[PDB]
Design an enzyme around this catalytic site. Structure first.
Site: not given
Ligand SMILES: O=C([O-])CC(=O)C(=O)O
Ligand SMILES: O=C([O-])CC(=O)C(=O)O
Lengths: 437, 437
Positions: A244, A274, A320, A329, A375
């Site tokens: 992105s 993504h 990742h 995160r 995610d």
């Protein structure tokens, strides 16, 4: 005398740093930083250090800072929403754009300027009401945003011949407008899809960005707005070299305006590889909720994990690209979790994916990072607040990610960073390169 | 026994090459193709060899080949259309995809399958009739592209769990449906725009792609249907490196489907530094046509040139990225013009740049390439056949640009090329890189 406005601030900043990297490049253009190899050039630039990009840097081991503001630095150092405890995302757009951590006042300015800019064109809304229910929230969401390039001040400018210097400016006005409109078109999908018949209402300009949107979705819980504010700060900027952000940077560089150039990128984000994976853990989770059945041992739960692995598939929300540690995160989302909902069936089956998943990729060594995502664990909190329509999940992600991406876009057009034109090679001719030569 | 179908060829072709580039990387993964330097890293990946890409390679001094097929090797060895002289771009798609130059049959095949596969969904048409007149035909374009992905087969496959192996396979069928429907959409934007009123009617299956288009554009000159076949050939592929190609390739690698993954690029191409500059030689060419006046000398012509240069501007149709030579795509259209319009104002003055412009950039050496573009040339011819709305020109391009994009994409999803996750560097961390370390 006088009061608040990020434009002025920038006009002061900007130059100082044009000079600043100029002396740098004077000195060290001369410098071989990394190495390019056949593997990387087969394997999608993994380790091949391609970009300059300021608006964030990821560390393998430590990860995402925002000046160097680590999320927990931001968490407590960026300003809070009058009656809450969370990093409120005008304070974050502040941070990345200026390297400075704001005044609450200097965020309020921000809020109320976005939710002054926050008006939707007839046609957008028409088109949006026309969207068929069979159409992804995201295929929709770019369609509008690619059609929003009607309101574009920059694109207006250029065609009349605004002088190079300037460029950064008008894209400061377009971006500011797009981050402003964005929410409403987020909310206005959701509601034409999922609650299909009701208005996304007014904008109280005595609300903040995050909160306006909560209102406009028709959600009513205070606490979900803290969560919302929070997502809206950690999904924001996560270096350059993701899909992105890299997209947007790129389609950015041919001097295509921020409207066009965001909505190129959500097609970046749209990619199941993504963004989708959000949506997709809880796909699996309804899948594990069915197909392995209600209550399991970590054995069939691990057989289920083997399940999908062996079936060639995609295990989202673990590992990742470049993050070789725990995503901050995740950890970020945990302490939020531990703090409002520790009592949940999918929550704690998230402290249970928290000891089994990777360890099936440790069994495997699929790719190099065994530890938790972003995610992962967001999905679980969405449901709690009675956000359940998991297609929409990456509409959310773009809304938060709008912060980042336009953030650098302002910087590249003030910094004159040219056109994203690589060299590509052919196999056959690469064959002529390495060995034949 | 049995008849024609690119698919079949593919399932023989694909392995052979997997294995091929397999050995190759076992031996030469370990090979370092060149260097990463800080100016490259602050100056847009210029020489910075970032890909392996198939469907075309571009040499500085030589330019575009297709297999190794130069434009002229093409012009001839590629099958032409049933009473006409021109490279017929179903044979071009042929060339790239297979490595092989076609038969007139298996171009008949290709025509015929396209003109089958060009249905259009309801909801496109709705919204294409909802486009207001002050959008560009490419903002208009993409939006209906990115919507179209409701008709994505691959986007459906993935949701249910097709196997990794399979991938090229579904993206075959989506792309073929794309390149198919795309021009119906191009045509429909013209016709809603400029021809405001009239239907884009038939598709005659026993016509050819380019022919059927011209038919739906409202254009009845036979001659403009050669130029078209031809345009549509040379605007196909121009390696990976460029914005639109590299964009698709990117959003591609994120397992987002063809539609979503073309459309992103077309905004990439919508960039004034990308494609808009068709449109913006003829932009200046009404600004010649006024502002220095009707019949001028190459003094107050030169003056003309130097004036927008000192006003810092962009000068389109001269120079280039990577090409240090006269584009094949120029000289290609030259040989056309010589044959069908050696009487023109804007032609012979299309050689009136042809000894003056870069010379003033030879005064300048602004960038490193003296000799012409493709944006240079084309847009003179187009008024020659009476296409004049120079806005639309860059819709013209992407129609051609769907070959090459959907071209490599298929080979990427069959080679199972990963996801382009580069490494971005911030300034201050670049700073601590080179010198501080
Ligand atoms: O950096 C990555 O590869 C993707 C990522 O986590 C992000 O875009 O937020
Ligand atoms: O490669 C370049 O930079 C642009 C180009 O000519 C193309 O996209 O056809």
């Amino acid at each position: 005398a006088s009061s608040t406005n990020l434009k002025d601030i920038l006009a002061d900043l900007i130059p100082k740093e044009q000079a600043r990297i100029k002396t740098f490049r004077q000195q060290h253009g001369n410098t071989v930083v990394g190495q390019i190899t056949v593997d990387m050039m087969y394997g999608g630039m993994r380790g091949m250090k391609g970009l300059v990009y300021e608006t964030s840097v990821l560390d393998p081991d430590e990860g995402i800072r925002f000046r160097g503001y680590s999320i927990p630095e931001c968490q407590k150092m960026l300003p809070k929403a009058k009656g809450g405890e969370e990093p409120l995302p005008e304070g974050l757009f502040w941070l990345l754009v200026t390297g400075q951590i704001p005044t609450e006042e200097q965020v309020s300015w921000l809020s109320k300027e976005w939710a002054k800019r926050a008006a939707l064109p007839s046609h957008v809304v028409t088109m949006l009401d026309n969207f068929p229910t069979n159409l992804h929230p995201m295929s929709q969401l770019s369609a509008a945003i690619t059609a929003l390039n009607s309101e574009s001040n920059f694109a207006r400018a250029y065609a009349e011949g605004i002088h190079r210097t300037k460029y950064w400016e008008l894209i400061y006005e377009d971006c500011m407008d797009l981050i402003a409109k964005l929410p409403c078109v987020a909310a206005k999908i959701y509601r034409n899809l999922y609650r299909e018949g009701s208005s996304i209402g007014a904008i109280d300009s005595k609300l903040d960005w995050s909160h306006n949107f909560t209102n406009m979705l028709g959600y009513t819980d205070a606490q979900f707005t803290e969560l919302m504010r929070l997502y809206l700060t950690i999904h924001s900027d996560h270096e350059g070299g993701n899909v992105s952000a890299h997209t947007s940077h790129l389609v950015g560089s041919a001097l295509s305006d921020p409207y066009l150039s965001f909505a190129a990128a959500m097609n970046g984000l749209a990619g199941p590889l993504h963004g989708l994976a959000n949506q997709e853990v809880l796909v699996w989770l309804t899948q594990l909720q069915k197909e392995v059945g209600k209550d399991v041992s970590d054995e069939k739960l691990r057989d289920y994990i083997w399940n999908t692995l062996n079936s060639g598939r995609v295990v989202p929300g673990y590992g990742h690209a470049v993050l070789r540690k725990t995503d901050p995160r995740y950890t970020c989302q945990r302490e939020f979790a531990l703090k409002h909902l520790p009592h949940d069936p999918m929550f704690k089956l998230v402290a249970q994916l928290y000891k089994i998943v990777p360890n099936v990729l440790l069994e495997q060594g699929k790719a190099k990072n065994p530890w938790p995502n972003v995610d992962a664990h967001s999905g679980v909190l969405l449901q709690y607040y009675g956000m359940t329509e998991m297609n929409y999940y990456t509409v959310l992600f773009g809304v938060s990610r709008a912060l980042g991406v336009l953030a650098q876009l302002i910087w590249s057009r003030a910094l004159g960073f040219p056109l994203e034109r690589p060299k590509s090679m052919s196999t056959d001719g690469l064959i002529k390169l390495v060995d034949s030569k």
